[PDB]
Design a protein around this nucleic acid. Sequence first.
RNA 1: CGUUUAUUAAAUGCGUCGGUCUAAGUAUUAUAUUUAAGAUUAUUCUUGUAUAUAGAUUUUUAUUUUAAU
Lengths: 97, 51, 35, 116, 50, 7, 55, 39, 212, 62, 56, 157, 217
Amino acid sequence: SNRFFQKFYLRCGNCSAIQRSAQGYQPIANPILFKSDEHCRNYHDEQRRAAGYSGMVVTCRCHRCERVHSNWKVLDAQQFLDAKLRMTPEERAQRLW
Amino acid sequence: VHANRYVDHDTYEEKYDPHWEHNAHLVPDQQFYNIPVPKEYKDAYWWRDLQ
Amino acid sequence: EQVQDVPTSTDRKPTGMHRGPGKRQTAPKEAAQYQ
Amino acid sequence: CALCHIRFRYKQDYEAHKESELHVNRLRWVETMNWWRETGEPAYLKASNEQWEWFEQHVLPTKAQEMGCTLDEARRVYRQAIMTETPTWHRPLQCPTVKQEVQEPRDQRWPASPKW
Amino acid sequence: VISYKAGDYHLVPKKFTVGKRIAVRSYLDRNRTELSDRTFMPQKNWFRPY
Amino acid sequence: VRATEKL
Amino acid sequence: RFNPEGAGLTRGTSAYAWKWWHTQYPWLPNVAPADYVPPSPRGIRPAAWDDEFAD
Amino acid sequence: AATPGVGIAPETTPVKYVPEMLNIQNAKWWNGRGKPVYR
Amino acid sequence: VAPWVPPPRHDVKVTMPPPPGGEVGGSYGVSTGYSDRLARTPYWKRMALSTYALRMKENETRYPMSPHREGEYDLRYTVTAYPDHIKHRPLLEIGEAHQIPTIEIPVIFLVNLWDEERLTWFGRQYETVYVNRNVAREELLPQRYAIYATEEAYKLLGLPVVNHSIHEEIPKTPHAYKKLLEKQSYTEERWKYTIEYLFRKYEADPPELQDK
Amino acid sequence: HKYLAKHGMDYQGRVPASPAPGMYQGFSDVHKILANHPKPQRESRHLPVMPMTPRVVFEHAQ
Amino acid sequence: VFHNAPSVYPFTKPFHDTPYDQDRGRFDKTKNILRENKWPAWMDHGADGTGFGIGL
Amino acid sequence: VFEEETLRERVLDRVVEGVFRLVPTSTDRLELKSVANIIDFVLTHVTVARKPLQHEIPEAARTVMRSHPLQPQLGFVHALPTDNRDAVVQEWERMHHLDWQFGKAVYEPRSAENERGNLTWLREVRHHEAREAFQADVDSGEARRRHMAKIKAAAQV
Amino acid sequence: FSTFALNPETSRAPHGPPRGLINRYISMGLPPWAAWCNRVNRHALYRMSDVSPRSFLPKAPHEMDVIWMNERVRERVRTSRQVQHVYRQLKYPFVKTGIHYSDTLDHWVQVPMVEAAMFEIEKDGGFDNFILKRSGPELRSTYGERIRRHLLVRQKETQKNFVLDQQAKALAEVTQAELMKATSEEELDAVLAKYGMDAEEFKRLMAKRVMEQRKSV
RNA sequence: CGUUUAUUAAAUGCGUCGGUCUAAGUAUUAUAUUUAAGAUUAUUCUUGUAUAUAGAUUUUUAUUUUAAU
Ligand SMILES: [Zn+2]
């Protein structure tokens, strides 16, 4: 349930391929027949993604090594430019997209 | 002041380490101007540096 | 599922020596053991 | 009945205890635990072995040449850790149902539903 | 190999502990019936070395 | 005494 | 209300034990004269014990 | 003789009943000695 | 009385204030740092000791992030200078029940350990095993049989650095754990999910056509 | 309790008054662990002298 | 603020009631211990029976 | 309890004077009246007898520890936290095994360390093996080159 | 909030700004319990937007003893049963008796720590590292500062007890060049007398070693 | 035989008795009560609290509490 959009820049651990994976708009569980557990843990969980995947294992499939794992280090987008701007123009074709 | 001091095997006293004073974190005091302690032991004095 | 015949009890000595409702019957951690 | 922490005050139920739903169920549970220890576990983690060592000799040889690496190195890319299995720590036993039951308007109302 | 059957090292010597957990001792568990040998048998002493 | 024990 | 020379008192504390409750002065622990130094492995052997016996 | 007025909490949870729990106003200019400590 | 009031924490740069406390390790609650060494030295002095190529290295704006507390947003731009509450949230929210189930952690065994009850191996030497959280802490670690399977533990021993994501996220519900077991069953014990292990049943004849 | 132990008998005589010098040396406000007698003495043989407690001096002042 | 003691909830809370205790404050009563006073004994109680040395 | 003089003299001339050839003063002969105390009185006056261990080193081995590269820091004992107060208030708290409890540790000076699982030991035996490897350059001379390659990278620019 | 059965993820609100009342408080960052406020004053949506949490520590930061990693005693406003009275109460964290084995000081050590520390210990590789990478005001304990000292000693004692193995191997190596031949057992005294590493200690020590060749076989 | 703010079949108090307690105090003991000493006796019967109890409630009266129209 993320009302707002946000795109992370996940860095794999196997190939360090900085791929970006966004988070769309997934609507709130219905309030009409409210359910206190499914809501208040939808919200509290939403701060934990909004703060750069704080307390969650990230599970997205790589683009370089085509496989899905849980090894991603979520890069704040000024730690990403720290990395992107500091790669020779060829390895940007290797690790970035 | 005696932490991390090469004892020399002639006078059995602390050799004068010129580096020590750079890894030293002067924790202040009232009856002493600024007591010097090595960097590793700096955090035990977290309250006095806040006082 | 053929494993749903979980015995509605468990060996564990009931904590709460005194008495009350809910004692000495299965727990959803024990119901997954026997399963 | 120390098995289930029951002092019996009324006779004629101390007799009818041995087949009571409390005793007979506590019998089954403290037995199947023995089953697991008596036969199950020393055989469960037997098969868990006899398939892994099958893999690391019957499949991982060819797989290590796929990574272009040495055979011993792959045993840390195809098994990064050996998550053995217990009664207390099973991964979901049955892959959850794929065809979920279809939602309906509330109280079997038919042309849609005004309310929730 | 190094055998180990589980339920061995408690992490605390088996005296200072309950099955698991170090136990509490607070001069109120203790009786005054010990320490009553003092009426004849005198307490320990520190004899200074000559 | 440690140099002793090696030998 | 205290009684020094009370054959309790752990024999180290007969002044500090006036303070402390009735329930806590029997247990006050033996420590030292506060000037007694640890037994020291010094070399002073009794005046006439001698070697052969000392050895 | 004295009184804390808070009532000694369990030795495990040392603080129940902060004065804020009651919607109390304790401005230094209002009742004087006010301003709390958990702040 | 304060003889020798200490100098500000991270005053080491010639023409910009030291970063605020808390960020350097100190007391939070104030956003803007300030050091009386810097504000007293006249401007030309601050422009004497520094060349243009340098100020562009200490002007440097690491805007949301903090240059010092790696990974956390700069505490002079948050709503208030305290640490980010959201990232460091206590594991239990203000209302949930503590149903954090039993969790099993990975430990690197250090001696070939061989159980004498199941007559099989707790763990080979130098292979990471998922063991109980209160076998490891109370029986495997105190004796020198095991250590944790952290990144740096691998570095110290000589093993290829493996990221088990040791407690990267704790599950606050059994079925929220039994999903995490499914994630960890994939990354760690991956040979379970090969097209060769999904077909041990069939590497040869469908059994109905073999001899007897 | 010190004659009976060391002599095997009841004392069977009038006990001396004026406690012996050296008894009740740790006590400070005896006055009850005694009769109202003074704290006996040091363990000396010097002539008896009243330890001038604040009380004895007052009696002089009467 | 009674509990300004070393936090030990399942163990015994040493000193708890005894004279040398925490969780009683600093400028408190119950500090007869601290009878150690720099001033000489004789000037807070006289050198003899007549309270000779008494004074400031 | 060896109390009655007839019993103390019957033990003290035999065990502490006879067997051990020790001689107790008068004021200690008072409390020297139990099997517990007889044992200690000996176990102080015999512990004050062992010649204090003589730290004597040779010369031929001495010049080794001097010229050897890796030397010991050797000041840490003071960093240890002090528990100085009245001995009774300090020891009343150890009424039970309050010893290893609440961030305390009975620090007995240790001369050898277990090498298995000891992070802080492997944390440096690699850092050492990373020092012998770097030291290999300075032996051969690839350090001077790789260091002389910086100044020629940092000169023409 | 939308009503379709299967709502696949998408960039933006597919059907306009999400309708409903609870979507009104989520569209502004608030949590879904704002739907139950009777007054939502500018302070109220400040109070409940968790700008700065109304949540404190049981003792002072300086006197804190039990290791509270990142926790406060947050007050939980409950609404009572059948007749809805609103009352609040201070909910603590769960402190466990942390009876660990810090292999730096080769012995168990106990420091009571919140559950969250008993996880972040294992995430840090040991109990001691969790003491060591935290810093002063961050690890705001007092026991953590008494056990950091023993940790800082009993580390700098390992490093010291290491250089023994480099001053000993130096002797052991350099003396072997003088234990070269077994010609004279009167000379093995003299080489040992050279480094003052006596014979009576070494001889039987090597004997116990060849017996240990027989103790280990 | 003491003791009390509108001063006494007020409330104390000894004994007996009921209940509790063998990891803080001595189970002919100390907690917790009801009575009142001394002398005679101390009756009939139970619907609820308590105890015991068996997922709990609902059931259920050795002794005790309260009850007996
Ligand atoms: Zn990848």
